[PDB]
Amino acid sequence: VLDQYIGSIHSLCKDQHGCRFLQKQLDILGSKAADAIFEETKDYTVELMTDSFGNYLIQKLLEEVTTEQRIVLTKISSPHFVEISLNPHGTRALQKLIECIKTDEEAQIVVDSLRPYTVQLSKDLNGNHVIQKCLQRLKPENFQFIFDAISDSCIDIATHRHGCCVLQRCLDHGTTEQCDNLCDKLLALVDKLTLDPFGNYVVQYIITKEAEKNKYDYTHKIVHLLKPRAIELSIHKFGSNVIEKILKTAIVSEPMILEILNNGGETGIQSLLNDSYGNYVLQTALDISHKQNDYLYKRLSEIVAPLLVGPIRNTPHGKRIIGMLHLD
RNA sequence: UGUAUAUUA
Numbered sequence: 001v002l003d004q005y006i007g008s009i010h011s012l013c014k015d016q017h018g019c020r021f022l023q024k025q026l027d028i029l030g031s032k033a034a035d036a037i038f039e040e041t042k043d044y045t046v047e048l049m050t051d052s053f054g055n056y057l058i059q060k061l062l063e064e065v066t067t068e069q070r071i072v073l074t075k076i077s078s079p080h081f082v083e084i085s086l087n088p089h090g091t092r093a094l095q096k097l098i099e100c101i102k103t104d105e106e107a108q109i110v111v112d113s114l115r116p117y118t119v120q121l122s123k124d125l126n127g128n129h130v131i132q133k134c135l136q137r138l139k140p141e142n143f144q145f146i147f148d149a150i151s152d153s154c155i156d157i158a159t160h161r162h163g164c165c166v167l168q169r170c171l172d173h174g175t176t177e178q179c180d181n182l183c184d185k186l187l188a189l190v191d192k193l194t195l196d197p198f199g200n201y202v203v204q205y206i207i208t209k210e211a212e213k214n215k216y217d218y219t220h221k222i223v224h225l226l227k228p229r230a231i232e233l234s235i236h237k238f239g240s241n242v243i244e245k246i247l248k249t250a251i252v253s254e255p256m257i258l259e260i261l262n263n264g265g266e267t268g269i270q271s272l273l274n275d276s277y278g279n280y281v282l283q284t285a286l287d288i289s290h291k292q293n294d295y296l297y298k299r300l301s302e303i304v305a306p307l308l309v310g311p312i313r314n315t316p317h318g319k320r321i322i323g324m325l326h327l328d
Numbered sequence: 329u330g331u332a333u334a335u336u337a
Contacts, residue, residue: 016337053337089336125334165333198332238331277330316329 009040019053023060034064046080049093059096078113091126095133107142118149128162135169147178154185164198183218200238204245223252230259231268240277247284257289257296269303279317286324
């Protein structure tokens with residue numbers, strides 16, 4: 001019950017060493033010490049949230065505070081979620097707030113506030129992590145808003161440096177109904193997403209998560225749409241990563257290697273040998289077929305061996321493919 | 329030989 005600093009808690013926030021202190025205070029006190037710090041600081045929560053040290057207090061304050069006090073802090077901050085979210089410190093406090101909310105009124109207020117700005121926050125360096133925490137902590141019933149918003153600006157988000165990370169959370173935490181809708185849209189531009197600096201990552205993730213669950217739906221729909229362009233995509237900087245992902249995925253592996261032999265032929269396999277990215281594909285196709293199926297490995301092997309003549313033998317990738325020809 | 333992802337003191 002020993003407070004010498006009471007009455008002037010707010011001034012202790014000006015310095016890093018002042019905020020660190022208030023937190024040790026909350027750490028050891030910590031109930032009565034919350035009614036205290038709460039009542040003195042509430043009026044500056046959106047200011048403290050976006051501050052270098054305050055925000056840490058706010059984060060301790062949220063763990064320690066009661067429900068009613070959180071609902072007040074939440075009500076006080078909601079008009080300021082956008083500016084809070086685009087902030088490096090603010091994003092941290094707001095994320096914490098979301099981690100701490102227990103009631104539906106709280107989740108209601110938060111989604112209500114964030115709704116109109118989902119796509120915007122989802123393209124933001126600091127903001128996108130607020131959107132991700134909604135996906136990670138809230139009931140699907142609640143974050144339905146995010147899925148709606150993101151499903152509509154689907155390609156915009158999937159092809160964005162940060163947007164693409166939010167899609168990955170959507171796939172992590174959403175309902176089957178929600179993901180299937182998201183994916184149905186994603187699939188409508190699997191071609192363009194595949195060739196994209198960021199979209200290719202989303203394509204790979206759909207495959208990753210199905211392989212995770214051992215239940216395959218869009219993995220097949222992707223492979224169906226893409227496979228006919230196996231070679232063309234194998235020699236693309238980004239698309240080649242998708243092709244390599246398909247190859248490393250056992251339920252679709254053989255068909256795709258078979259696509260290389262079938263419609264690539266000796267020609268397309270030459271292209272792969274000499275290409276900046278294509279050769280990594282060839283290496284993987286060889287590595288995999290080796291492990292998975294000898295007929296395929298042999299058919300591969302006997303086309304490569306004749307083509308591994310000349311200056312190619314001395315190249316970095318040449319040596320690396322040469323070393324993949326007698327593994328049995 | 330080839331891609332992203334603030335880990336605020």
